[PDB]
Design a protein around this ligand. Sequence first.
Ligand SMILES: CC1(C)CC(=O)N(CC(=O)N2CCC(N3N=C(c4ccc(OC(F)F)c(OC(F)F)c4)[C@H]4CC=CC[C@H]4C3=O)CC2)C(=O)C1
Ligand SMILES: [Mg+2]
Ligand SMILES: [Zn+2]
Length: 333
Amino acid sequence: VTAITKVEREAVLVCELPSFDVTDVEFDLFRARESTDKPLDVAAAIAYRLLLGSGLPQKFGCSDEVLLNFILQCRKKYRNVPYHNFYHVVDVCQTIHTFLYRGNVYEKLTELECFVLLITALVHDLDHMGLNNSFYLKTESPLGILSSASGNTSVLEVHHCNLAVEILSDPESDVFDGLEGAERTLAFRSMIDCVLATDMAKHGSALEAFLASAADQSSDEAAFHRMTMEIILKAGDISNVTKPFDISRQWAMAVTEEFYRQGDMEKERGVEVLPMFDRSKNMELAKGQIGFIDFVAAPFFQKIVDACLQGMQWTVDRIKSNRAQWERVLETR
Ligand SMILES: CC1(C)CC(=O)N(CC(=O)N2CCC(N3N=C(c4ccc(OC(F)F)c(OC(F)F)c4)[C@H]4CC=CC[C@H]4C3=O)CC2)C(=O)C1
Ligand SMILES: [Mg+2]
Ligand SMILES: [Zn+2]
């Protein structure tokens, strides 16, 4: 990895974020990005401020400069795609911060685990190209062939972990360099476990395991911690429907356009195009959001909150308010 420069750091360090509270559940990243002509720097500054404000990097021997270096090394490996770009990972990082600290999920985890989760947010989609795992498998792309030959169908997630390990292999961007022995092993394993658990093909199994652990007062403690981390990163990843409506809608627009660009490529290659990826199906945003809410997000958030994460009740509340608002879009159309 090429070293991050003084000038790259300074460009983040000059951003002051006047009028934003990066800790708040109603924080608006889109408004942040509209606030200046250097939205990549502002986004990096948001992530930097979240991580320093937690007080965690300092505790684990991670200097301000190495933190910032890490952030910028992550930033350089996001692509200019509509949804899976740097702003998504910063959003996930900020969202996780709220679940840990406004939702009191920090109480279930060690400080190191909280630190790992915040850092893992920033790595969890590295070098996404706006195409899902299915695209690579269907088209027998080289990465798809490799995944199948090597026995792991989570095509992208293994790729993201690869790039995360590369970033962390240089002390100048290794936020875990202050760790050794068991703690360092836990930091890397937990980060990788969490990234691997973001594959939506494993959603139901991940959720069911967590719920069975939370219900068992004799669950293995280390396993419960790890599953809680996995579920929190998953929660962040499907959290767009938990945000104020207008934020939620802007995310939905970005994901829809990404999906449509995939579908356009699949059409060119003569492979199967799912309806949600087909521009010509012209699917209404409201109906798709209601469907994602009903079949994925509402039961996920309700189940985890009820099982164990009572402080995150607001997520269920906001999903219910967003669903009602989409229903009003349909009612008035
Ligand atoms: C069609 C149905 C009636 C039945 C059904 O099975 N599903 C689920 C479904 O079709 N899935 C599962 C999730 C997948 N998925 N979808 C993402 C995503 C993000 C934000 C979204 O909008 C808003 F929140 F911004 C969004 O909503 C829109 F798609 F509806 C989807 C990502 C989540 C995690 C990782 C990468 C992205 C990923 O793997 C896509 C396939 C239904 O949607 C209803
Ligand atoms: Mg992902
Ligand atoms: Zn993601």
